[PDB]
C-alpha cells in the first residue's frame, strides 16, 4: 500500500515573520534572497563598490575575478566588500576557466580567504566547464555553499549534469545564457538546448537552473519562472529557478 503505486510528476510566494514577501524557488531558498542575480562581467562587476551596492540593495551579484591580476588587488577588493555588506552576507566570485594562469593563483587564494573566515560562499566558473575531477576538488576543498557554471553548449550542459550527479548533496547552479546574452557568448540558440536537456537537468535535484539571455524586465522573465516560455514551442511548462 505504501510504496507500490508510483505517480509521475514552479515559483511560489512565501511571507517571513517580518512581513517581507519572497518569490520562493530553489535559487531563492539556497541564497535566502530574491531569485534575481547580477552576472560576473568584466569590467562592469570588477569594482567592489558596485558589488557592495547590489548586495546592499538586497540581491545576488558575482564579483568578476577576471579584472584582478594579482592576489593583493583581489584580497583588497574582497576585504572592502566584506566590510561594506550586511553582516552575514555571502560573497560569490566569478572566474574565467580559459585563463589557467589566473586560475592557478585565484583558486588557492579563495580557499585561504574562506579559511580565514571571509564570507565567500559561491564560485562561478565561466568560459568553459572543468572536468569532474577538477570540479570535485573545488567542491570538496574550498568550503563553498554552491558552485555555478556558465555552459556554452549542449555538451557543456551535460558536463554540468555529470558534475551535479557526482555531488548529489551539493548545490550546483547552471547559468544558461545562449547566443542572445551580451559579452562573450556561444552561437547556440537560447531555447533549443534547454528544450532538449530540460528533463535531464530536472533529474538532478541539486541543480538550480538560471536563465540569462539579455533579460531586462519583469514581463520578459516571468514566463521563464512560470515555465510558460516552453508552451509556445509545443512543450509542457518548464520553470526556471531564477534569472540573471
Amino acid at each position: 500500500e505504501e510504496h507500490a503505486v508510483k505517480y509521475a510528476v514552479g515559483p511560489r510566494l512565501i511571507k517571513t515573520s517580518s512581513g517581507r514577501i519572497y518569490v520562493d524557488t530553489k535559487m531563492s531558498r539556497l541564497l535566502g534572497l530574491p531569485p534575481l542575480m547580477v552576472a560576473g562581467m568584466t569590467p562592469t562587476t570588477v569594482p567592489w563598490d558596485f558589488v557592495a551596492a547590489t548586495m546592499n540593495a538586497g540581491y545576488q551579484i558575482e564579483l568578476a575575478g577576471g579584472g584582478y591580476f594579482n592576489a593583493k588587488m583581489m584580497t583588497e577588493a574582497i576585504s572592502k566588500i566584506e566590510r561594506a555588506i550586511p553582516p552575514g552576507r555571502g560573497i560569490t566570485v566569478n572566474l574565467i576557466y580559459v585563463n589557467p594562469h589566473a586560475m592557478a593563483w585565484q583558486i588557492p587564494l579563495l580557499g585561504r580567504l574562506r579559511a580565514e573566515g571571509v564570507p565567500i560562499e559561491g564560485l562561478t566558473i565561466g568560459a568553459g566547464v572543468p572536468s569532474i575531477e577538477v570540479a570535485n576538488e573545488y567542491i570538496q576543498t574550498l568550503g563553498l555553499k554552491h558552485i555555478s557554471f556558465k555552459p556554452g553548449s549542449v555538451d557543456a550542459i551535460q558536463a554540468v549534469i555529470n558534475i551535479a550527479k557526482a555531488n548529489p548533496t551539493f548545490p550546483v547552479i547552471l547559468q544558461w545564457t545562449g547566443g542572445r546574452g551580451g559579452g562573450h557568448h556561444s552561437y547556440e540558440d537560447f531555447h533549443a538546448p534547454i528544450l532538449a536537456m530540460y528533463s535531464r537537468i530536472r533529474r538532478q535535484e541539486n541543480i538550480i537552473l538560471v536563465a540569462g539571455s539579455g533579460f531586462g524586465g519583469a514581463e520578459d522573465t516571468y514566463p521563464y519562472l512560470t515555465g510558460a516560455w516552453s508552451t509556445k514551442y509545443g512543450y509542457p511548462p518548464m520553470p526556471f529557478d531564477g534569472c540573471l
Partner: protein, 188 residues
C-alpha cells in the same frame, strides 16, 4: 565614446531606457513585478493565502526530524522534552545531524537556528558553528529541553555523567530578552 568598445546584449538594450537608474530601483521593479504576477496567478490577489515562515533561506531542503534512535531514551511532556543517550559502548551514537535535528525540533526558531546553522557570524566573518560540537551526542549524555514549544521560555540543559550515578550540568542555553541567546558552558 564613439571610439570605445562597449559591451551590450542585443535584447537587453531595449530594456536599458534610463541613464543612472539606481541598481535597487531596477531589481526591485523586476522582483515586485514577479510578486504581483504570482499574487494574481496563484493566490487570487489574496495575501492571506501566502504561507508564513519565521525566516527564509538556509538549506535547499529541511532535514526530516528523525525521532527514533537506537540507544536514546526520549520522553515528551507538555513543558519538557528529555533525551538520554546510552552509556553502553556496544550501542552506536546517533548521527550528528539527525540528533541535532531532533533537539532543534520542526519549527524555525532561535533554537532551530542555533543548532542547525552551519556557520555563526563573528563580526563580518564566518565561523563553523561550535554549537554543533558542544551539543554532539556523547555516551551517557542527558539533554533536557524545557518549554520546547514556547521559544521565549525555552531552556536547553545538557548534563554529563563523569562519575557513576551523578549528572552534572555542562551546558545551559536560553533566550534572554527578545533576541539575545545566552549559552553557558559550565565547569563542574
Amino acid at each position: 565614446v564613439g571610439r570605445t568598445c562597449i559591451l551590450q546584449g542585443p535584447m537587453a538594450a531595449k530594456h536599458s531606457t534610463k541613464v543612472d537608474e539606481p541598481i535597487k530601483e531596477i531589481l526591485d521593479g523586476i522582483h515586485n513585478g514577479h510578486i504581483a504576477a504570482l499574487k494574481r496567478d496563484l493566490y487570487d490577489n489574496d495575501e492571506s493565502k501566502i504561507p508564513t515562515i519565521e525566516y527564509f533561506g538556509g538549506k535547499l531542503k529541511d532535514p526530516e526530524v528523525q525521532l527514533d534512535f537506537e540507544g536514546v531514551t526520549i520522553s515528551y511532556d507538555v513543558h519538557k522534552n528529555t533525551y538520554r543517550v546510552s552509556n553502553n559502548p556496544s550501542v552506536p551514537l546517533p548521527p550528528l545531524d539527525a540528533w541535532l535535528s531532533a533537539l532543534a525540533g520542526p519549527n524555525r526558531t532561535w533554537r532551530y537556528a542555533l543548532l542547525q546553522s552551519e556557520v555563526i557570524v563573528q563580526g563580518h566573518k564566518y565561523q563553523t558553528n561550535p554549537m554543533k560540537k558542544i551539543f554532539a551526542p556523547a555516551r551517557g549524555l542527558f539533554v533536557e529541553i524545557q518549554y520546547p514549544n514556547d521559544p521565549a521560555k525555552t531552556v536547553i540543559t545538557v548534563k554529563e555523567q563523569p562519575r557513576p550515578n551523578r549528572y552534572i550540568d555542562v551546558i545551559e542555553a536560553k533566550l534572554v530578552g527578545d533576541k539575545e541567546i545566552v549559552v553557558n558552558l559550565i565547569k563542574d
